[PDB]
Amino acid sequence: SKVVVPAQGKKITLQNGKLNVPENPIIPYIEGDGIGVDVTPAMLKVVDAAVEKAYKGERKISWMEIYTGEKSTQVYGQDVWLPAETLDLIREYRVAIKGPLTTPVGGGIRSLNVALRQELDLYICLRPVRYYQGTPSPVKHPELTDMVIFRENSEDIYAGIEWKADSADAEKVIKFLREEMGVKKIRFPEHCGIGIKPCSEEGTKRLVRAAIEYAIANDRDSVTLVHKGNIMKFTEGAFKDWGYQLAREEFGGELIDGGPWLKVKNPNTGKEIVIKDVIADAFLQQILLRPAEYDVIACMNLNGDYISDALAAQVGGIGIAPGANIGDECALFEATHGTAPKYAGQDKVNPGSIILSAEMMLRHMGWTEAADLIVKGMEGAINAKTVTYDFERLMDGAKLLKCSEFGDAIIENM
Amino acid sequence: SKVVVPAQGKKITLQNGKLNVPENPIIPYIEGDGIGVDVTPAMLKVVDAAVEKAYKGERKISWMEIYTGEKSTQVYGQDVWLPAETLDLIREYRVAIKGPLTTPVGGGIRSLNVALRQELDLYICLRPVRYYQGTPSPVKHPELTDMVIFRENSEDIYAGIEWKADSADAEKVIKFLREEMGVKKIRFPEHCGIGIKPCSEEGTKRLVRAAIEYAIANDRDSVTLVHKGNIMKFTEGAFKDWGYQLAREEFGGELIDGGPWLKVKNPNTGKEIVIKDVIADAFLQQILLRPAEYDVIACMNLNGDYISDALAAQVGGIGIAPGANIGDECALFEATHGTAPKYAGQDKVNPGSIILSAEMMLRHMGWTEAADLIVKGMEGAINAKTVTYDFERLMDGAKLLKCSEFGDAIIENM
Ligand SMILES: NC(=O)c1ccc[n+]([C@@H]2O[C@H](COP(=O)([O-])OP(=O)(O)OC[C@H]3O[C@@H](n4cnc5c(N)ncnc54)[C@H](OP(=O)(O)O)[C@@H]3O)[C@@H](O)[C@H]2O)c1
Ligand SMILES: NC(=O)c1ccc[n+]([C@@H]2O[C@H](COP(=O)([O-])OP(=O)(O)OC[C@H]3O[C@@H](n4cnc5c(N)ncnc54)[C@H](OP(=O)(O)O)[C@@H]3O)[C@@H](O)[C@H]2O)c1
User: What is this protein's function (chains A, B)?
Assistant: First the structure.
């Protein structure tokens, strides 16, 4: 009802597991709450400039705004935070992008971001994290970090299955656990909240399957299964066993030494990709202490949230970290930072995250020239130290830029 | 049967919630697997020197070795990894310490460390993390970190309640969830592992209760409730609500501004302690980016493992991080690093962790003079750059020391 389909423009289709993108594709975008009003306009202009420059006017995106979050309630009504129409629009047009989203508190509503992921079955959360020269960073050698996180996106405790302490359901579940499953380890059964943590074999293998294909298509050096399997043997640990098993079953994994690592040969470059694993709490230490040893990461939903968010901070990219939610049929790219309501509307915020997510989106569309230009623009703008206040306040000799002006700087550095 | 109670020596008792420690107390200690054979002897000698120097010969510990892990199987037999006698010994003598422990794989045995914590109901995992000048660190300003972690120690998913995919129990639980609880969010119900995540109100409030008392007794600046409550509302989120509620109910918490932070007045110094909260994935970023803003931390079991282990790495103290497991009746202090089998027996390992845990143990015993001397010794030895290989290999100008020699250096710097 209130979305306007672009007069000129054409739908992306999926054929044979491969996107068919027209030169005039319609892309759905969600402005986002808070500073989404600042960064989305910059992102539109930066992407159009990259597309115009890479294909000399032969291609062009027909943006189409759709809604989620506050703007959805002001467009559709009182408690329409995520209209069915927005899900249908993303499935019809295959590829979309959105700014920051916040979920209201006090109405029993659970994460809108996670709702999008789970209802579009975008089981890959893809966070590439690598250091942009010139970025102010808390660690000494941020340039050693160059990883790609494959975070499982629908199952784990992150999935939102839980009962409230003292509710009839929680006490029903606890009664079933103690009396029918014989559980004795619930220290205090009264006034106790309960959460469920599921992890299946198919969900594990389609997430690791994507990670290893990614290592192959991008010739990277390894895939590390991160887990907390010595405590949670049947979810985290199973994730790690199924991941190794997939590597053997579908990518000819061979045993290194006495194990447990494997090596997968890259069919296209001959490079032996190492498959290995690290327990999650030690991994949070290793990304600081021995960052160059890691590359592609495969892990479950909650660990992936932590790991992405720790890596982004340690390269000083907490505000420019790109992110994508990808499934077999649809894809939703997103700004990964908060809504920062304090500065919303002041044209202050750093648009780098949603712009790099747009870079991912173009590359997912097969428009790699335009995507390369955006990386190149971020490269030069940040290396030139012409940046927004969240960068500039941490450093000397930088030129302070509004949000919109940083978008221009990126275009100027393409 | 194989433990020898010390001829001379006397049992610590608990009276009125307060330890009564004799001048000749018997302390039970577990050597620990792997490098425990290296660091425990250094720790015995360092603690005895501190006690001898602080009390001029009037006090002295009667160590008593007890067993867990490999040495237990070689002392008691084939699969005796954790003899009942060791639990009884720790409850009889109240205070003990142990080196690194590893749990065997392939026999269905779950963490020996966690078994000790849960069966002695040591619900506080206490990790103080602060930077020792001279330590090689991956970040630029490690000296800004000075935190104390209160990690909940018996409940959360960390508690080891789970079924294996395809087992009759997992399929029984999944059937109950889908058919009797109406759960629709399990993406793939087949071949799916299940874990339970419990969090009670009493468990939350006795853990936060200890954290706030600690902030009071040590005049620190704040207590931060760390959680992942926007996704797990009834466990992580409840932990955070119960924590605030305790602060109001028992420590006169008053609202700051419009909330949600509180302020608790320190009954002894008048200092207003801030009670606040941060969501766990953002917190892993904040301990890097704004570390000076945090002090005492209160959080649940799994987050506490991650947070302690990330902080230790970021001050370069991955091998000297102290740790204690404390309950209302018993206490078990521990080395917090792995068993490092590769270097075990070579007198290489860094004894700093178990020695600082001994420092905690003495201070828990009321022997604060001896504890102060050990801190002072670690201070000087590390500042003098007379350290073991894990420090020395990361730095220039250091003097390489065996494990035993570093223990001497600590004594020499008391
Ligand atoms: N993945 C996501 O899209 C995502 C993840 C979590 C939360 N959010 C949402 O965001 C809301 C915003 O409000 P909050 O105050 O509660 O946030 P908050 O995350 O605790 O705070 C974020 C802070 O990071 C900075 N920042 C955020 N985005 C930035 C960007 N793009 N460029 C530069 N700096 C940026 C601002 O700090 P300075 O003022 O220091 O610059 C900002 O206020 C939350 O309630 C939440 O639902 C979105
Ligand atoms: N809290 C605990 O007590 C605890 C926690 C987890 C694991 N562990 C156990 O430890 C076992 C040891 O074997 P792993 O090889 O599997 O360990 P791992 O933790 O993956 O490796 C630890 C590495 O840290 C270094 N290190 C460990 N303790 C140190 C110390 N005290 N001083 C200086 N450097 C230290 C050594 O690295 P460099 O060679 O680079 O120096 C070491 O091999 C594990 O299987 C596990 O059950 C104990």
Answer: Catalyzes the oxidative decarboxylation of isocitrate to 2-oxoglutarate and carbon dioxide with the concomitant reduction of NADP(+).
* Contact between B177 and A200 using a beta-carbon 8 Å cutoff: no
Instruction: Tell me the Cα Rg of chain B.
Output: 22
Phi, psi torsion values for B339, nearest 5 degrees: -85, -15
**Token representation of residue A257:** 């030494």
Contact of B86 with B98, CB cutoff 8 Å: no
CA distances from A56 to A50, A282, A362, A367, B65 (A): 10, 49, 16, 13, 78
Please identify which residue in the block is written with the tokens 């390992």. B349
Pair A376, A413: CB distance under 8 Å: yes
> Which residues of chain B come before a gap where C and the next N are over 2.5 Å apart?
none
Phi and psi dihedrals of A139, rounded to 5? -100, 165
In ligand 1, the atom with minimum distance to the C-alpha of A334 is 3
Token pair recorded at residue B359: 């420092």
Going from the Cα of B339 to the center of ligand 2, the distance in angstroms, rounded, reads 5
Residue of A2, A3, A25 lying closest to A14 (CA atoms): A25
Technique that determined the structure: X-ray
Domain residues of chain B, as ranges?
Answer: 1-414
DSSP, residue by residue, B315-380? TT-TTT---EEE-SS-EEEE--S---TTTTTSS-S-THHHHHHHHHHHHHTT-HHHHHHHHHHHHH
Are A412 and A376 within 8 A, CB to CB? no
Please, what's the b/e burial string for A356-395 (b: 16 or more CB within 10 A of its CB; e: otherwise)? bbbbbbbbbbebeebbbbbbebbbbbbeebbbbbbbbeee
How many angstroms does the Cα of residue B88 sit away from the middle of ligand 1?
51
Element (DSSP H or E) covering residue A363:
helix A352-364
Q: Which residue's entry shows tokens 């468990």?
A: B203
Resolution for this PDB entry, in angstroms: 1.9
Strand bridging mode A399-400 / B272-279: unpaired
Question: Are residues B165 and A234 in contact, defined by beta-carbon separation less than 8 angstroms?
Answer: yes
CA distance A13 to A28: 14
CB B242 within 8 A of CB B208: yes
In Å, how far is B105's CA from the nearest CA of chain A? 9
Q: Please give the Cα distance from A290 to A288 (Å, whole number).
A: 6
Q: Give the Cα separation of B46 and B408 in Å (integer).
A: 7
Q: Which residue has the tokens 């390894």?
A: A222
Nearest bound ligand to CA A403? Answer: 1
- How far is A31 from A74, CA to CA, in rounded Å? 13
With contact defined as beta carbons under 8 Å apart, do A64 and A47 qualify?
no
Asked about A228 being catalytic, the answer comes back as yes
CA distance B167 to A234: 10
